[PDB]
């Protein structure tokens, strides 16, 4: 809410809220797509680890954080990728590493396919970008409805160690879900039948086998939203890829496994 | 030869050739089971990264390196686990992290099951321990016959990037396989019908599900000897485990992805460090 709000810049036509920390090689973080989500809520623990050696760019995708929600915006993969390229052009960033969490991972893969010249290394965490049967969990996430109780439960789905889902955490995230116009745009994106959306965010197997990017796929064994089976698949499709699965870990690999995650990612990028 | 030959000690009643470098928390490196294999040959590129923070123990399992090959020894999973334990008792090592390579990962799992109080953290690299249909590769390896050509192909099977398999290496490991008594004992361990050995070396799904050890499972996607599918099973069975898979990499993960491999393994054992 407070620190979830960073800088403002006109990207690809929309006023975008984002974070720009660190200097050097650019690294873009794309948050997932849950109610109340934001660049900062998804990456406040990761950013510090990377800004010690990189310039971390963590924006709020069109209609998600505190980024404007255009009066008649048509949300789609292409739109979101146009937004990502918008932000990169506004900041005059030619090539950058991309870290995508689920919804963000799908976008990352989509972006690496359509704008190869702007993407270097990729980090896909419980990423989207490949078809998989909608899970009860994902359905819960996209089907969210404002309510401290619904949020808490929702958060339970993401974590493996429910112990991390504290009342305070539940309240705070809930508050964000009911920010001015947040639920509005959110409940308008992945309505009732959902398999469609996952398929719309995915990239064909053929295409993906094209990706020449050095890639790190991270997934929690017990991920309840995005099935492990989905990353194992990307581990097959992508050529220059590494696959790392955490045990006793939910979807938010970067939270439940902050240390291991930041260590793997930072080292992964240091290779370049 | 030469460098592969190190210290000598009596463990479980058998002269064992082994390497002991570094100091502090102990880590035991258990080699694979290819012809000519030795602890040093398998870990010479891993020892340097480890020796800076741990006491590295790299022994030659009975009948594999320059360790004595008894005149009637009955090579079996239990007999080997007992050798490991023997090695540990000899060096007066109570508990230790273990890194197993295939055949070694199998022995590592067995050890952690039979001597839970002697094993801390594990690193199973393209490890055995679960059943899996024998592969043309594992077959080509256990069915090896002395010959520079034969070795070159054996190595091509182990590697993703054949550019690593140079004539020199093939010639050196060939000479390693034809050391007095080496081939004689190798060829008498995994005869024609081999599915047996994989099964005997493995551990029940039940038992594996029991292991409480923090575990790091590593494997090469293009592994031609032990199928990636095996590690995935281990990743399902072992509770406190991580699974790391390298793309564009053969069986010897520690050789084709050295730096990547050494970092995960050193960093992994570091997580078990408590202050003062």
Provide φ and ψ at A171, rounded to 5°.
-60, -55
Neighbours of A152 (CB within 10 A): 18
- Integer CA distances (angstroms), B53 to A262, B25, B90, B212, in order: 22, 8, 22, 24
A44: closest CA among A97, A3, A84, A104? A3
Non-local CB neighbours of A149 within 8 Å, separated by 6+ positions: none
- Integer CA distances (angstroms), A80 to A66, A229, B88, B261, in order: 15, 25, 58, 36
Nearest to A247 among B242, B248, B263 (CB): B242
A161: closest CA among A44, A257, A79, A29? A257
Distance of CA A86 to the CA centre of its chain: 17
Which residue, among A242, A246, A248, A260, would best test binding to B if mutated, counting the most B CBs under 10 Å from its CB? A242
d(CA B237, CA B231): 10
Number of domains in chain A: 1
Contact at CB, A245 and B235, closer than 8 angstroms? yes
Nearest to B248 among A232, A239, A245 (CB): A239
- What the block records as the tokens of B195 is 């599915």
Contact at CB, B247 and A245, closer than 8 angstroms? no
d(CA B85, CA A185): 63
DSSP B192-219: S--HHHHHHH---HHHHTT--S-EEEEE
d(CA B41, CA B28): 15
d(CA A82, CA A19): 18
d(CA A50, CA A40): 14
d(CA A222, CA A228): 8
Which residue, among B243, B260, B267, would best test binding to A if mutated, counting the most A CBs under 10 Å from its CB? B243
Angle of CA points A127, A133, A134, to nearest 5°: 75
DSSP A35-97: TT--HHHHHTTHHHHHHTTSEEEEE--TTTSSS---TT----HHHHHHHHHHHHHHTT--SEE
d(CA A118, CA A107): 13
* Phi-psi group of A53: left, alpha or beta (phi > 0 → left; psi -120 to 50 → alpha; rest → beta): alpha
DSSP class of A166: -
Whether A151 and A35 have beta carbons less than 8 Å apart is answered as yes
- What the block records as the tokens of B91 is 């060096």
d(CA B246, CA B64): 28
Determination technique for this entry:
X-ray
- Residue A141 C-alpha, separation from nearest chain B C-alpha, in angstroms: 26
How many residues belong to chain B? Answer: 276
Query: Which range of residues forms the domain containing residue B249?
Result: 1-276
CATH at A138: 3.40.50.1820
B216: closest CA among B203, B229, B235? B235
Whether B54 and B22 have beta carbons less than 8 Å apart is answered as yes
Indicate the SS3 state at residue A7.
Answer: strand
């Amino acid at each position: 809410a407070n620190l979830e709000i960073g800088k403002s810049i006109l990207a690809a036509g929309v006023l975008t809220n984002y974070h720009d920390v660190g200097e050097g090689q650019p690294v873009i973080l794309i948050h997932g797509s849950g109610p109340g989500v934001s660049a900062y809520a998804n990456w406040r623990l990761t950013i510090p680890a990377l800004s010690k050696f990189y310039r971390v760019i963590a924006p709020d995708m069109v209609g998600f954080g505190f980024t404007d929600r255009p009066e008649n915006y048509n949300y789609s993969k292409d739109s979101w990728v146009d937004h990502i390229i918008g932000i990169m052009d506004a900041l005059e960033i030619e090539k950058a590493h991309i870290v995508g969490n689920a919804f963000g991972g799908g976008l990352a893969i989509a972006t690496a396919l359509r704008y190869s010249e702007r993407v270097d290394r990729m980090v896909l965490m419980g990423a989207a970008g490949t078809r998989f049967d909608v899970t009860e969990g994902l359905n819960a996430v996209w089907g969210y409805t404002p309510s401290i109780e619904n949020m808490r439960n929702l958060l339970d789905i993401f974590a493996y160690d429910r112990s991390l889902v504290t009342d305070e955490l539940a309240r705070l995230r809930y508050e964000a879900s009911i920010q001015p116009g947040f639920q509005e745009s959110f409940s308008s994106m992945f309505p009732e039948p959902r398999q469609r959306w996952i398929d719309a965010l995915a990239s064909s197997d053929e295409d993906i086998k094209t990706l020449p990017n050095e890639t790190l796929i991270i997934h929690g064994r017990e991920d309840q939203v995005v099935p492990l089976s989905s990353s194992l698949r990307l581990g097959e499709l992508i050529d220059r890829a590494q696959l790392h699965v955490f045990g006793r870990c939910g979807h938010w690999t970067q939270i439940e496994q902050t240390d291991r995650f930041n260590r793997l990612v930072v080292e992964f990028f240091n290779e370049a």
